[PDB]
């Protein structure tokens, strides 16, 4: 995964995460954030702070710190790709130019942050936000451009 170290922020989900102590229950606040510039660079992070704005800010900082470069062309994907992370599995396929993003939720947030316009996306695992976004970014990272495939194989006129 090429790290490639302005991107807008998208809040995927927040969680009311608790703790048990003899005195009582102490509550934290977690948040998954994805940063992207709709260009081919997307990062994700997890903020774990007390207040909701503090958690969102920490997640934004973590997502900005951890960024990768996703090879894209126009607004579609070069080929179909399936990837599983944890209890979640994702499948992405290219679609027609006048189709838009056909998926909702964490998949929609990740694909909007990466800027892909036309894509057919389906989730076959669980609806966990962490594993879902991680599987989607893994699927995007394992994606090879036609130029990259040509460079790895040799000649660039292999498709003929």
């Amino acid at each position: 995964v090429y790290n490639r170290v302005e991107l807008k922020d998208r809040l995927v989900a927040i969680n009311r995460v608790t703790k048990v102590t003899k005195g009582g229950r102490t509550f934290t606040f977690a948040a998954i954030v994805v940063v992207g510039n709709e260009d081919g660079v997307i990062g994700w992070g997890l903020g774990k702070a007390g207040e909701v704005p503090a958690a969102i800010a920490k997640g934004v900082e973590a997502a900005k710190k951890n960024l990768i470069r996703v090879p894209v062309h126009n607004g579609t994907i070069p080929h179909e790709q399936a990837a599983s992370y944890g209890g979640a599995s994702v499948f992405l396929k290219p679609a027609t130019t006048g189709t838009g993003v056909k998926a909702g939720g964490a998949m929609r947030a990740v694909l909007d942050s990466v800027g892909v316009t036309d894509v057919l996306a389906k989730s076959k695992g669980s609806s966990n936000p962490h594993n879902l976004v991680k599987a989607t970014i893994q699927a995007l990272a394992e994606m090879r451009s036609p130029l990259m495939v040509a460079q790895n194989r040799g000649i660039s006129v292999e498709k003929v």
Binding site: P78, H79, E80, P94, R144, P146, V149, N152, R153, G154, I155, E158, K159, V160
Partner: protein
């Protein structure tokens, strides 16, 4: 042995996973054809055939970048338990045209591109990309 072609694909895949540079195989005619197809399509560095007292040996030197192999996935399609036959009009595209499918046809053993050019179908041996 049950499926020698699947065994050949598995040997190649295991060598790629282990990051070896060469791999040896007990030779066969259809496997000689498959490795010739792979070499002319640009997935391995080179090959060599050694005709010994046995059926023979195939030695394949694989292709690595300046450390990623040129081959990403090998998938056997027509297994003995379920044979797959297709025509030229319904032949499949592997990795949306960036990968190949080895196909045995009455005109010989070639890929899906050459098979669709020659308008002939047959057995789909494997998907390679």
């Amino acid at each position: 042995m049950t499926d020698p072609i699947a065994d050949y694909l598995t040997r190649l895949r295991n060598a790629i996973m282990a990051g070896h540079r060469v791999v040896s195989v007990p030779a066969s005619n259809i496997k000689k054809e498959i490795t010739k197809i792979l070499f002319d399509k640009g997935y391995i560095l080179n090959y060599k055939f050694e005709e010994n007292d046995s059926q023979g040996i195939i030695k394949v030197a694989l292709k690595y970048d300046l450390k990623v192999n040129a081959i990403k996935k090998l998938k056997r399609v027509s297994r003995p338990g379920l044979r797959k036959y297709v025509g030229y009009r319904d032949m499949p595209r592997v990795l949306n045209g960036l990968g190949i499918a080895i196909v045995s046809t009455p005109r010989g053993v070639m890929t899906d591109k050459e098979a669709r050019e020659l308008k002939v179908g047959g057995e789909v041996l494997c998907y390679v990309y």
